[PDB]
Amino acid sequence: LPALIDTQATAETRALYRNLAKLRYKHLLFGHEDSLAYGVHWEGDMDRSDVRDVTGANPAVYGWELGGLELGHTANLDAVNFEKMQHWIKAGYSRGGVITISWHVFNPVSGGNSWDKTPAVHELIPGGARHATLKAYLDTFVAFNEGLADVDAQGNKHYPPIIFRPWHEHNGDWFWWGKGHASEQDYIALWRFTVHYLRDEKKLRNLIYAYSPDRSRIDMANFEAGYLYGYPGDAYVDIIGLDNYWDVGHEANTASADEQKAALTASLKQLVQIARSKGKIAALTETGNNRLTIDNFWTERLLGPISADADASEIAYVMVWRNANLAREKSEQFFAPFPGQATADDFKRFYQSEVVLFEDELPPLYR
């Protein structure tokens, strides 16, 4: 029933959106960022995942990250080689998995990263002095996407559908495209240009566009207003997403576990209500407990609160963040377990839930 903003989306992209719309009522796809690239204790293997090492299954949704692509780098900001990334995207898609991509775009004014708050949005949008830079940046994604294509025996080009999730957490003040660093109207112009450029100028037909405010900067007494800060319009969004690490044990959150569980449910309930009103699909696009220090995190802090409310449960997927390689990154950062990690058995239970789908459990999503 929901319809994509790309009325000419490829058959596979249209099928994915339709099938997510159908599956969301009774199921939840599990996602993991950089899942094939490395794990906490390994890197190099061309077909491995911490998630699979624990459960025997790959995640249903594979998240990837393009930061650095726009600068012509051979690897992204976390040293994930782009050629390998293309291989991994194609591999996951070939197995029936779902692909989603975020983009921690470097600051074009300073050359710094996304956390360099030097103002840039006003300069990047149409009419701005650096508008040529925005086009060049987006062109690098167009080229990357070409490296995902195959051509069949009839000479037709095929691509993996991608849930493209740009300019995220824009209601936060930590990225240069965030509140305090860009006007609301300029953010909207940036978003709208991104869609026009990719969908209309460059005629990419394999994208589904995901919008993703951060829950930690939404007033729960006025959720809809907070959620819709910088909202670019229904003609520019397919997935009503949300990044919520807050209600799942963020170190800075003084709320009790019980209040956090209630807030998680409430945030997702309202997210789904917004999606329903707009004829879209909702998803928890980022979440997790860093270093998985919470007993029975998966069943008690994630699945439980989602399943407690039939509205909240209507999210289509939930993705947790990356399992940073320790030997490389110098600190422990991870959101899925690895073998021997304390929450591994509870993660197996999460996998075993009839509601939660990993790659091995997916129906054919692409028709």
Ligand SMILES: OC[C@H]1O[C@@H](O)[C@@H](O)[C@@H](O)[C@@H]1O
């Ligand atoms: O993946 C992009 C960024 O995501 C953040 O949450 C951290 O994991 C960073 O170290 C990383 O560079």
Ligand code: NA
């Ligand atoms: Na399952």
